[PDB]
């Protein structure tokens, strides 16, 4: 069932990307109300959002292609499955960069208009720190497992373990994403 599972992980990544684009929209609404110009790092933010967004689209497109290729070869192919794992990992890392950019943006806006000491903000800040550490450690573990599986291409269990790694990284990203949505709603309700 690895190929099918890879499809579900790819679909989760795509839906997380849409969700991320929505949060980026919300942040831009808020930035237009709170900030003046483009200093404090905002000019760069805008460009980097766009850079990682086009990178992620491109990784999703590559992953789709590999996914179709793997599905056409099910009856024959460890290397296609290992390759797809690399694609999913790269997409997850690019999404993590985007996520860190939205976290930075929410933190800059929050500091202008609200105390960081109340209304759920202290807990928000710890949870962001915790899930950021967790996601980084899962990405590093996925990178190590990916190198091991690639080392074993020269002709099972490493593959299953990497499926678990990817899934757990996607889960932790979803939690980070639900924290960013909460942050945005608190700011929206305050200042719009």
């Amino acid at each position: 069932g690895i190929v099918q599972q890879q499809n579900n992980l790819l679909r989760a990544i795509e839906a997380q990307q849409h969700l991320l684009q929505l949060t980026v929209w919300g942040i831009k609404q808020l930035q237009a109300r709170i900030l003046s110009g483009g200093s404090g790092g905002w000019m760069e933010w805008d460009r980097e959002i766009n850079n990682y967004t086009s990178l992620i689209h491109s990784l999703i497109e590559e992953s789709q292609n590999q996914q179709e290729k793997n599905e056409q070869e099910l009856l024959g192919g460890g290397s296609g499955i290992v390759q797809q794992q690399n694609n999913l990992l790269r997409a997850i890392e690019a999404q993590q960069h985007l996520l860190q950019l939205t976290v930075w943006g929410i933190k800059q806006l929050q500091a202008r208009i609200l105390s960081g000491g109340s209304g759920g903000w202290m807990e928000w800040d710890r949870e962001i720190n915790n899930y950021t550490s967790l996601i980084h450690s899962l990405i590093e573990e996925s990178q190590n497992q990916q190198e091991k599986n690639e080392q074993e291409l020269l002709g099972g269990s490493g593959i299953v373990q990497q499926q678990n790694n990817l899934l757990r990284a996607i889960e932790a990203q979803q939690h980070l994403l639900q924290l960013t949505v909460w942050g945005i709603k608190q700011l929206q309700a305050r200042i719009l």
Binding site: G1, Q5, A15, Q16, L19, L22, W25, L167, Q178, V181
Partner: protein, 31 residues
């Protein structure tokens, strides 16, 4: 817009949590 944003989000956030249902109950199987 913010209420029909809030539609879009909870109804992707539906899709994802219930993909992550599926993926985890494949990963049951894998072990």
């Amino acid at each position: 817009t913010w209420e029909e944003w809030d539609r879009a989000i909870a109804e992707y956030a539906r899709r994802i949590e219930e993909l992550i249902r599926a993926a985890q109950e494949q990963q049951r199987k894998n072990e």
